[PDB]
């Protein structure tokens, strides 16, 4: 209802919502069979 | 967290501290999954071998934190619990199978830049992302060095720490330990050869293992810090509760009340 | 070890 409210989940106010990356998140994304 | 680094501010706005209120101590990590619900490991609350048995009034949840020991005056929110729910088949006698618990907060928290829930995975997010070799991220305020064997080299952090770790193949997991591994667990960590280190450690139990989806850019909680032999010991791995395999009970209990 | 929290939280 939507989720438990959110819906908004997993998007961080200071990072995803401002299109800013954290310092190491590239390491995660590069291990997911890189991607392209 | 062993061999991690300091989190950025707002890097993990779902991290919760489980805090007991006399004596004042950090018990465990936890995570915010909505405005009223916190997810943690059942062993944080209930562990008869050690006569641990916390109820609601024994505990405070603290949300929005970065500093381990400061009261973060206009940033953190402290909340009280109204109900604790442990999985009815949590196995504390043998292997900590179904190491999961839900806490209902007495009243909802407000979100902010520092406080924001994580998502729970669905079937296809689980299927796709839970694969050996893919990295996830663990956070917490636990020891920096081995403490079921209490350590030096620095001890406890001042601020929230972070480490990214690969998921490991189930055979190497099961072959690293004498404990019986279930399907409700997975393991994570670097292998002796791979050069890199890192692990959770004591005081980190209960907190999130999260991964970011490459399809929709959201953070999903795939595990809970559950157990491990030592901290960062070579040829040993951390074990996590498998959040997707237990999602029906999660839904079941937040639908039953559910209010 | 922890800084003191407000007494309305106890
Ligand atoms: C929680 O804070 C702590 C550590 C979790 C992270 C450990 C890691 N990844 N290295 C808890 C912990 C750790 C291990 C056990 C344990 C060891 C061997 C066999 C067990 O039964 C299956 C359990 C127990 C605990 C309780 C600590 O609170």
B254 touches chain A (CB under 8 A): yes
d(CA B197, CA B164): 10
**Partner residues linked to B91 by β-bridges:** B97
Which is the closest atom of ligand 1 to the Cα of B28? 2
Number of helices and strands in chain C (H, E): 0, 0
CB atoms within 10 A of CB B248: 9
Residue ranges of domains in chain B: 1-12+118-244, 13-117+245-258
Chain C residue at shortest CA distance from B78: C9
The resolution of the experimental structure, rounded to one decimal in Å, is: 2.2
CATH 3.90.650.10 fits B13-117+245-258, yes or no: no
* Residue A34 backbone zone (phi > 0: left; psi -120 to 50: alpha; other: beta): left
Closest C-alpha to B69, from C4, A9, A12: C4
Cβ(B225) – ligand 1 distance below 6 Å: yes
Q: Positive or negative CA dihedral for B212, B130, B66, B79?
A: positive
- A5, A23, A25 ranked by CB distance to B34: nearest: A5
Question: Which ligand 1 atom is nearest residue B2's CA?
Answer: 10
HSE, side-chain direction, 13 A CA sphere, residue B18: 30
SS (H, E, C) chain B: CECCEECCCCCCCCEEEEEECCCCEEEEEEEECCCCEEEECHHHCEEHHHCEECCHHHEEEEECCCECCCCCCCCCEEEEEEEEEECCCCECCCCCECCCEEEEECCCCCCCCCCCCCECCCHHHHHHHCCCCCEEEEEECCCCCCCCCCCCCCCCCCECEEEEEEECCHHHHHCCCCCCCCCCEEEECCCHHHCCCCECCCCCCCCEEEEECCCCCCEEEEEEEEEECCCCCCCCCEEEEECHHHHHHHHHHHHHCCC
- Residue A6: partners with Cβ closer than 8 Å, 6 or more residues away: B34, B35, B117
Contact B231, B200 (CB under 8 A): yes
**Which residues in chain B are closer than 8 Å to A14, comparing Cβ atoms?**
9-11, 13, 113
The CATH number of A1-36 is which of 3.60.20.30, 3.40.50.720, 3.40.50.300, 4.10.140.10? 4.10.140.10
Topology given in CATH for the domain delimited by B1-12+118-244:
Thrombin, subunit H (2.40.10)
Asked if the Cβ–Cβ distance from B135 to A16 is below 8 Å, we say: no
């Amino acid at each position: 209802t939507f989720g438990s409210g959110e819906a908004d989940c997993g998007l961080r106010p200071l990072f995803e919502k401002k299109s800013l990356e954290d310092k190491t998140e590239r390491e995660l994304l590069e291990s997911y069979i890189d991607g392209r | 967290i062993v061999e991690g680094s300091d989190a950025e501010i707002g890097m993990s706005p779902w991290q919760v501290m489980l805090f007991r209120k006399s004596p004042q101590e950090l018990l465990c990590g936890a995570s915010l999954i909505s405005d009223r619900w916190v997810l943690t490991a059942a062993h944080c609350l209930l562990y008869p071998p050690w006569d641990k048995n916390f109820t609601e009034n024994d505990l405070l949840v603290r949300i929005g934190k970065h500093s381990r020991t400061r009261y973060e005056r206009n940033i953190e929110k402290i909340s009280m619990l109204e109900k604790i729910y442990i999985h009815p088949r949590y196995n504390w006698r043998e292997n900590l199978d179904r190491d999961i618990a839900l806490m209902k907060l007495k009243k909802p928290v407000a979100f902010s830049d520092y406080i924001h829930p994580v998502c729970l995975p669905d079937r296809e997010t689980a299927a796709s992302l839970l694969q050996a070799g893919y990295k996830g991220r663990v956070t917490g305020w636990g020891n920096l060095k081995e403490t079921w064997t209490a350590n030096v080299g620095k001890g406890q952090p001042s601020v929230l720490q972070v480490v990214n770790l690969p998921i490991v193949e189930r055979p190497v997991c099961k072959d690293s330990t004498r404990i019986r591994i279930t399907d409700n667990m997975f393991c994570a960590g670097y292998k002796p050869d791979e050069g890199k280190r890192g692990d959770a450690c004591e005081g980190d139990s209960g907190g999130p293992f999260v991964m970011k989806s490459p399809f929709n850019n959201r953070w999903y909680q795939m595990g809970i810090v559950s157990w491990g032999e030592g901290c960062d010991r070579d040829g040993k791995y951390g074990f996590y509760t498998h959040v997707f395999r237990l999602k029906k009970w999660i839904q079941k209990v937040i639908d039953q009340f559910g209010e | 070890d922890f800084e003191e929290i407000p007494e309305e939280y106890l």
